[PDB]
């Protein structure tokens, strides 16, 4: 009805032009010249679906040129192979050019890792939508893919098959205790490894293609075995006799059982529910539920079929906790009290049930839809869309919502947030046509 029409009209106005050609979308239409890579994913997929592919092509070509190609030994300059979080059009010189934001002057001088992984997934989306892999096989694209894989695969100090990162290195780009091996990045890493293997010419690239082939099954089993939480699993951990000869090594990360909030999880988890943990590392298990990681795990077949149904069962049965009045919680539960202070450093923006700290993010509804369709329960997404439809247009498409139920328009939420609009539309498109999953799986 009028809701979808208004969304389309809004999405159109968000398009960003460079040298007269569309090169992405702005984060929120009112800088006026700023495209975020992660934000562009939902817009991009819509445009692909609607056959307007040139915007995506131009985005991929332009961002590829922004990727640092050489090893970087100097402070405050981006690491080799990274994709910037955002870029903008600088019209101030006689001629237009693009300026990358790698975070060099940001409040955290960290380059988020998700952008380069989404870039690969977008590249695959484009070639599948175009029914033509030619772009990907061009030498500059082979190089781009290869460099991203190298920085992700190469071991530095940490040798787990997962990707080790500083805090605030993904969609959650502030301090939320997601340093280490956060789920979001491992899941994207897995999906990107799969996508890169489909598009890389193996000849000449033997080292990297081999490393990709070696990493995929190790990373899959690692995540399935060491991130999976359900009631059976938690009880098995508690009864596990670690002192017995040869059983210590089973507890790979040397998790101490006393650290797990059993009472609260036992209560929260449905009988047949479960999910992948937010983070796992030495003496570290973050039992927060993170939506993006869990939903993307379903979409990429990282989660087993049984795990996927368990995740969907959790979402259905704890619908009020995870969706409430606005799909959906970025994570659950909130860090509060002492834990909030220690983990976030008292970040004012990240107070309990706000923003990154278990705020509700409409954009996540596109992945909820994709996952629901993939899991054969598309009615779950339908229900989420109905809830969103009730308030998004009236509220002028906010970036996020706050509170345990997502009742409040986010404390500092921008209006006409593009991924809120695109997330909404994309969810609806995936419902109408489940076969569109092939763009992202």
Ligand X SMILES: OC[C@H]1O[C@@](CO)(O[C@H]2O[C@H](CO)[C@@H](O)[C@H](O)[C@H]2O)[C@@H](O)[C@@H]1O
52-81: which residues touch a second copy (CB under 8 A)? 71-80
Calpha distance 34→24 (Å, rounded) = 9
171 vs 365, beta carbon nearer ligand X? 171
Closest approach of ligand X to the CB of residue 398, in Å: 12
105 vs 271, beta carbon nearer ligand X? 105
- 438 in contact with a second copy (CB under 8 A): no
Of 30, 93, 246, 249, the one binding a second copy by CB under 8 A: 249
Calpha distance 430→438 (Å, rounded) = 11
Interface with a second copy in residues 140-159 (CB under 8 A): 150-151, 153-159
Specify whether the CB–CB gap between 110 and 172 falls below 8 A.
no
89 vs 312, beta carbon nearer ligand X? 89
- Which pair of structure tokens corresponds to residue 127? 């070639």
Residue 389, binding choice from a second copy, ligand X, none, Cβ under 5 to 8 Å by partner class: none
Interface with a second copy in residues 342-361 (CB under 8 A): 342-348
Closest approach of a second copy to the CB of residue 130, in Å: 30
- CA dist list (Å): 324 to 229, 300, 360, 366, 384: 23, 26, 9, 16, 9
Per-residue contact flags (x/-) with a second copy for residues 88 to 127, judged by CB under 8 A? --------------xxxx-xxxxxxx--------------
Which residues, in sequence order, are CB contacts of 34 under 8 Å at separation 6+? 16, 26, 27, 86, 87, 88
Which residues, in sequence order, are CB contacts of 415 under 8 Å at separation 6+? 28, 395, 396, 397, 398, 399
Interface with a second copy in residues 384-413 (CB under 8 A): none
23 vs 330, beta carbon nearer a second copy? 330
Per-residue contact flags (x/-) with a second copy for residues 282 to 311, judged by CB under 8 A? xxxx--------------------------
Question: What phi and psi values does residue 242 have, to the nearest 5 degrees?
Answer: -60, -30
CA angle (196 as vertex; 195, 201 as ends), nearest 5: 130
Closest approach of ligand X to the CB of residue 367, in Å: 14
- Which pair of structure tokens corresponds to residue 41? 């994913």
90 vs 154, beta carbon nearer a second copy? 154
| Residue 9 C-beta-side C-alpha neighbours within 13 Å | 8
Give the footprint of ligand X on this chain (CB under 6 A). Answer: 27, 36, 38-39, 171, 173-174
Closest approach of ligand X to the CB of residue 326, in Å: 17
């Amino acid at each position: 009805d009028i809701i979808e029409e208004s969304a389309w009209e809004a999405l159109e106005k968000s398009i960003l032009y460079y040298k007269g050609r569309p090169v992405g979308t702005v984060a929120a239409f009112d800088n006026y010249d700023q495209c975020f890579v992660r934000d562009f994913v939902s817009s991009a997929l819509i445009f692909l679906i609607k056959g307007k592919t040139d915007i995506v092509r131009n985005f991929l070509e332009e961002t590829l040129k922004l990727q640092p190609k050489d090893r970087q030994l100097d402070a405050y300059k981006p690491g080799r192979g990274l994709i910037p979080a955002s870029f903008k059009v600088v019209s101030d010189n006689g001629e237009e050019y693009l300026e990358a934001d790698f975070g060099e002057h940001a409040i955290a001088r960290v380059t988020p890792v998700d952008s380069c992984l989404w870039w690969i997934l977008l590249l695959r989306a484009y070639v599948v939508a175009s029914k033509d892999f030619s772009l990907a096989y061009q030498p500059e694209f082979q190089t781009g893919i290869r460099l991203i894989m190298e920085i992700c695969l190469a071991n530095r100090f940490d040798m787990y098959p997962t990707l080790l990162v500083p805090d605030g290195a993904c969609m959650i780009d502030r301090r939320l205790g997601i340093y280490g091996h956060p789920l979001e990045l491992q899941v994207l890493f897995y999906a990107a490894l799969r996508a890169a293997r489909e598009m890389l010419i193996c000849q000449g690239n033997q080292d990297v293609v081999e490393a990709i082939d070696n990493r995929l099954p190790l990373l899959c089993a690692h995540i399935r075995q060491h991130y999976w939480i359900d009631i059976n699993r938690l009880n098995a951990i508690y009864r596990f006799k670690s002192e017995e000869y040869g059983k210590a090594a089973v507890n790979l990360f040397n998790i101490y059982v006393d650290s797990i909030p059993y009472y609260e999880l036992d209560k929260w988890l449905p009988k047949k529910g479960g999910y992948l943990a937010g983070n796992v590392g030495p003496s570290q298990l973050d039992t927060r539920f993170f939506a993006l990681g869990n939903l993307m795990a379903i979409i990429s077949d990282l989660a087993t079929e049984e795990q996927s149904q368990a995740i969907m069962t959790l979402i259905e049965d704890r619908w009020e906790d995870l969706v409430g009045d606005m799909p959906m919680k970025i994570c659950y539960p909130a860090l509060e009290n002492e834990e909030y202070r220690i983990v976030t450093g008292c970040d004012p923006k990240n107070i309990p049930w706000s923003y990154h700290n278990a705020g509700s993010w409409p954009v996540l509804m596109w992945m909820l839809a994709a996952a629901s369709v993939k899991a054969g329960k598309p009615y779950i997404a339908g229900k989420a869309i109905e809830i969103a439809q009730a308030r998004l247009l009236e509220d002028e498409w906010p970036e996020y919502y706050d509170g345990k139920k997502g009742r409040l328009i986010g404390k500092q939420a921008r209006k006409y947030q593009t991924w809120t609009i695109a997330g909404f539309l994309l969810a609806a498109e995936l419902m109408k046509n489940p076969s569109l999953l092939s763009l992202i799986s």
